[PDB]
Amino acid sequence: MSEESQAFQRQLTALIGYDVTDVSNVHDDELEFTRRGLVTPRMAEVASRDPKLYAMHPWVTSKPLPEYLWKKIANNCIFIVIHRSTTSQTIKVSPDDTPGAILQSFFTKMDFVLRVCGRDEYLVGETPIKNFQWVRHCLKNGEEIHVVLDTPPDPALDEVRKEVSLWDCDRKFRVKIRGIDIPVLLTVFVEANIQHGQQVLCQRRTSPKPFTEEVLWNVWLEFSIKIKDLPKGALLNLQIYCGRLLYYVNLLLIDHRFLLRRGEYVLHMWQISFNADKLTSATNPDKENSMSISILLDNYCHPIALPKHEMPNQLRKQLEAIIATDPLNPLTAEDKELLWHFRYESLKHPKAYPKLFSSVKWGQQEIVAKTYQLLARREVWDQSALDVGLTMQLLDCNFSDENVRAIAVQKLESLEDDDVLHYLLQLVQAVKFEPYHDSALARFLLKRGLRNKRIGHFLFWFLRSEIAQSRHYQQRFAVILEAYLRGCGTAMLHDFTQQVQVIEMLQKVTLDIKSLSAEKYDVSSQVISQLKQKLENLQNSQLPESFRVPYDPGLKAGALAIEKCKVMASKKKPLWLEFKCADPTALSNETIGIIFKHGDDLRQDMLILQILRIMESIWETESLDLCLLPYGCISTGDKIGMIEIVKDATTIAKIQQSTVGNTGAFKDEVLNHWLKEKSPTEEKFQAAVERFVYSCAGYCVATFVLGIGDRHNDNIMITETGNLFHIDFGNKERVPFVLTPDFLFVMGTSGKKTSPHFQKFQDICVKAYLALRHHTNLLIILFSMMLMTGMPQLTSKEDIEYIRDALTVGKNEEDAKKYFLDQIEVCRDKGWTVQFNWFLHLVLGI
């Protein structure tokens, strides 16, 4: 423990935002055991990754070139403008070529690597040039592929620092509820529940006594279950109801060492303000204001859970009907008993696993043991093609068993980096449903991070996001981050530092300029100086030379641009900031637009934004583009965070506020005028018109399904290139989504007719809607996880099921294609009704 090793920990604690050495809010050594446990996966992956490739973090995909991309290349040859000092020449390179093929056969026509100008993206590795993500991004936006001919980054910069019984106890389980002690204030009773994967097994209560600062009981709660029957994962959930639920706390009956919990406990509970926070094994660190629960566990010696070593056609059809059901459709006892009985038969269908392992009676050891027998042989699931939507299901709050969950993590392993990045956020979030800190999932994330800088970059911010504002899961998440920062490399270790410094500094300002204004949502004149002033105050010798853009790790942001910085006219007062690109190779003077806001939980914007990236790739599988704009959004604090800025993009409302004004006399021709006027060449007007139809279709569908299509006119934007997109995702009038008359005007149907564009629109919709329905289960699980992992409010069964109706489950496919168009019609039959109401509701406060 050198003085040097004692400062490093002081450092990490800063890059994490929580000190993983604060045994002040723990009743055991699980976290510590976990840090000690992650030391191997970390080092193992660290001392196993190719230093060269890792240094350049190539970004590729094995997926086939989409229809629109493939069917767009000039026959079988493309062009990549190569750069150097100042010189540059264009080369004809086939799609199936490789970085090795080029550069080498190129070197002999006039020992070095190809890097994208302005970015930290090198095109290296033995992979088809077409397989490179960045390149696909070029073709997509129809752009040239310029790259500087420079030397490979020194792989030595990623250096890493110097690194007694069993089932022989048939006595019923009991717990002594000594009392509850609350510092400062009808009746109140304690409710102990033996839980397992949100599945309540046994439950007891205490005599309703008077609610005072201290309410004793010293009453033993005898359950009906048995010690031998307690499953590895069983959780002791303690709750307090009034004379409704008020305080809840949990305690894992079986610990990380497979040992039965025992002794005295004075756990500090959480107070209610269903979701993943009620599942936490952590205690409230606020020992001064939090309710306390004193309990006692029977005194013994040391019991330990040992680590275990043809049908009627009418029934077949009945089983099948159960297996081919959506994730949200429950199971009757008949169902479960049916599923169980036919274990092995239900084992031949991967799609049956979630439903199958939910029919298990985990409150019975003999059964659980049998279950472990079923997992002993699963060639079907093991050989079946990976199904994320299926894999994800086994990772939610419905499966507290590590053996079951570990089979999903096993499937995840198959996923290439590209895919890991698509689901990273939800996976990270899925750690909340893990009954123990050290878990197969936690490790997978760690490995995949230390394995790839990209994944590693994002893993950091996702994890950090939670640690900052989540008292319920910060610890576990903090220990998982520490394990990552200790193997990613001094290089990244330094990038993260630079990144954190900037952020923290900018948050200071963001919240500073916020106080200097209340109900006056009008940016004062003397406040414009306050901002410009403080900004330069940092440029002096504070703001690092050039941090890296969190939502875009490839981008290096240099010095600011105080001149172009301001404070949006929002009743919250965000911070519009522009940055110069630190990379002098970027063939553009164009700045970097980043926003900093407070008041809205950007964690929700994140989830919703990532789902959008999902829907875009989901369509790519069906060869379909919708031009969505899932701009970058990274959370960092409670109601703080940063956001990317789309260039040349205006509010749809503002485009109306121009031609019209401070009224609701919305005119249809407005929008269509904006495009043609903004886009000079008659050609660009034509193209901008197409983008809109596609972008509008894309967002119309996605927003509907997510249940966030009916939003004010202010929450929707558009670009001088026709691309449209939504924003700020953080007894009356309603609507599926937004398809206002000004929109349809650009399609060719001012009134209620049709056109060669509106039919294009409708056709694209269903072609997109039916595509997402193909992945009904995936979207249901994600949406379901997003709600209980991201949406604070105690998500109800009713809220989650909205996704079912939206995707029209059960209903035939034919009725679907029609169901959507019907929704479109609902919009036409409302013109500016819903919108006009939002104006009267918001702009007039009614």
Ligand X SMILES: CC1(C)CC(=O)c2sc(N3CCOCC3)nc2C1
Residue among 276 and 717 whose Cβ is closer to ligand X: 717
Residue among 255 and 578 whose Cβ is closer to ligand X: 578
459 is in an annotated binding site: no
472 is in an annotated binding site: no
462 is in an annotated binding site: no
Residues contacting 698, CB < 8 A, separation 6+? 615, 616, 626, 627, 628, 768
CB of 728 to ligand X, least distance (A): 3
298 is in an annotated binding site: no
Residue among 594 and 778 whose Cβ is closer to ligand X: 594
Chain breaks after residues in the chain, where C lies over 2.5 Å from next N: 110, 163, 185, 243, 273, 309, 730
The Cα 231–Cα 222 span in angstroms is: 18
Residue among 572 and 580 whose Cβ is closer to ligand X: 572
Residue among 12 and 595 whose Cβ is closer to ligand X: 595
Q: Do residues 572 and 560 make contact, with C-beta atoms less than 8 angstroms apart?
A: no
The Cα 199–Cα 368 span in angstroms is: 14
Distance of CA 12 to the CA centre of its chain: 24
Residue among 436 and 725 whose Cβ is closer to ligand X: 725
Q: Which of 217, 236, 229, 226 is nearest to 176 (CA)?
A: 217
594 is in an annotated binding site: yes
Q: Which of 77, 110, 107 is nearest to 95 (CA)?
A: 77
Q: Is 353 exposed, middle or buried (0-12, 13-18, 19+ CB in 10 A)?
A: buried
596 is in an annotated binding site: yes
Q: Tell me which residues touch ligand X (CB under 6 A).
A: 568, 570, 574, 595, 597, 605, 631, 643-646, 649, 717, 727-728
Distance of CA 648 to the CA centre of its chain: 27
630 is in an annotated binding site: yes
648 is in an annotated binding site: no
CB of 660 to ligand X, least distance (A): 21
CB of 560 to ligand X, least distance (A): 18
Give how far Cα 142 sits from Cα of 68, 414, 721, Å.
Answer: 11, 32, 13
CB of 571 to ligand X, least distance (A): 9
Give Dmax over CA atoms of the chain in angstroms.
90
Which phi-psi region, left, alpha or beta, contains residue 565 (left: φ > 0; alpha: ψ -120 to 50)? beta
Residue among 364 and 715 whose Cβ is closer to ligand X: 715
CB of 527 to ligand X, least distance (A): 16
Residue among 645 and 770 whose Cβ is closer to ligand X: 645
Distance of CA 762 to the CA centre of its chain: 30
595 is in an annotated binding site: yes
- Please compute, for residue 396, the number of CA atoms within 13 A of its CA located in the half-sphere on the CB side: 28
Q: Please give the structure tokens belonging to residue 658.
A: 């121009």
Q: Edge-to-edge strand order for the sheet containing 214-226? A: 214-226, 172-181, 292-297, 263-268
What does DSSP say about strands 292-297 and 113-116: parallel, antiparallel, or unpaired?
Answer: unpaired
Residue 153: how many CB atoms within 10 A of its CB?
17
Q: Please give the structure tokens belonging to residue 593.
A: 């637009």
- The secondary structure of 16-31 as a DSSP string is HTS-TT-TTS-SSSHH
Q: Which residue type is seen at 371?
A: T
Residue among 703 and 776 whose Cβ is closer to ligand X: 703
CB of 713 to ligand X, least distance (A): 13
Residue among 483 and 718 whose Cβ is closer to ligand X: 718
CB of 691 to ligand X, least distance (A): 16
Q: Edge-to-edge strand order for the sheet containing 82-83? A: 88-89, 82-83, 147-150, 113-116
Q: Do residues 264 and 212 make contact, with C-beta atoms less than 8 angstroms apart?
A: no
Q: Which residue is nearest to ligand X (CB)?
A: 728
CB of 715 to ligand X, least distance (A): 7
Residue among 79 and 521 whose Cβ is closer to ligand X: 521
601 is in an annotated binding site: yes
CB of 627 to ligand X, least distance (A): 14
* Count of all residues that appear for the chain in the document: 846
CB of 552 to ligand X, least distance (A): 13
Question: What b-and-e string marks burial along 167-185, b requiring 16 or more CB atoms within 10 Å of the CB?
Answer: bebeeebbbbbbbbbbeee
CB of 658 to ligand X, least distance (A): 17
728 is in an annotated binding site: yes
Residue among 274 and 551 whose Cβ is closer to ligand X: 551
Residue among 594 and 771 whose Cβ is closer to ligand X: 594
Residues contacting 535, CB < 8 A, separation 6+? 509, 560, 562, 565, 577
CB of 396 to ligand X, least distance (A): 28
The Cα 175–Cα 192 span in angstroms is: 8
727 is in an annotated binding site: yes
71 is in an annotated binding site: no
Q: Do residues 485 and 15 make contact, with C-beta atoms less than 8 angstroms apart?
A: yes
CB of 696 to ligand X, least distance (A): 17
Helices and strands per DSSP (H, E), number in the chain: 31, 23
802 is in an annotated binding site: no
628 is in an annotated binding site: yes
600 is in an annotated binding site: yes
Q: Please give the structure tokens belonging to residue 182.
A: 């609350």
Residue among 439 and 591 whose Cβ is closer to ligand X: 591
CB of 603 to ligand X, least distance (A): 12
319 is in an annotated binding site: no
Q: Do residues 351 and 324 make contact, with C-beta atoms less than 8 angstroms apart?
A: yes
Annotation: binding site for ATP: 593-602, 628-636, 725-730
Annotation: binding site: 593-602, 628-636, 725-730
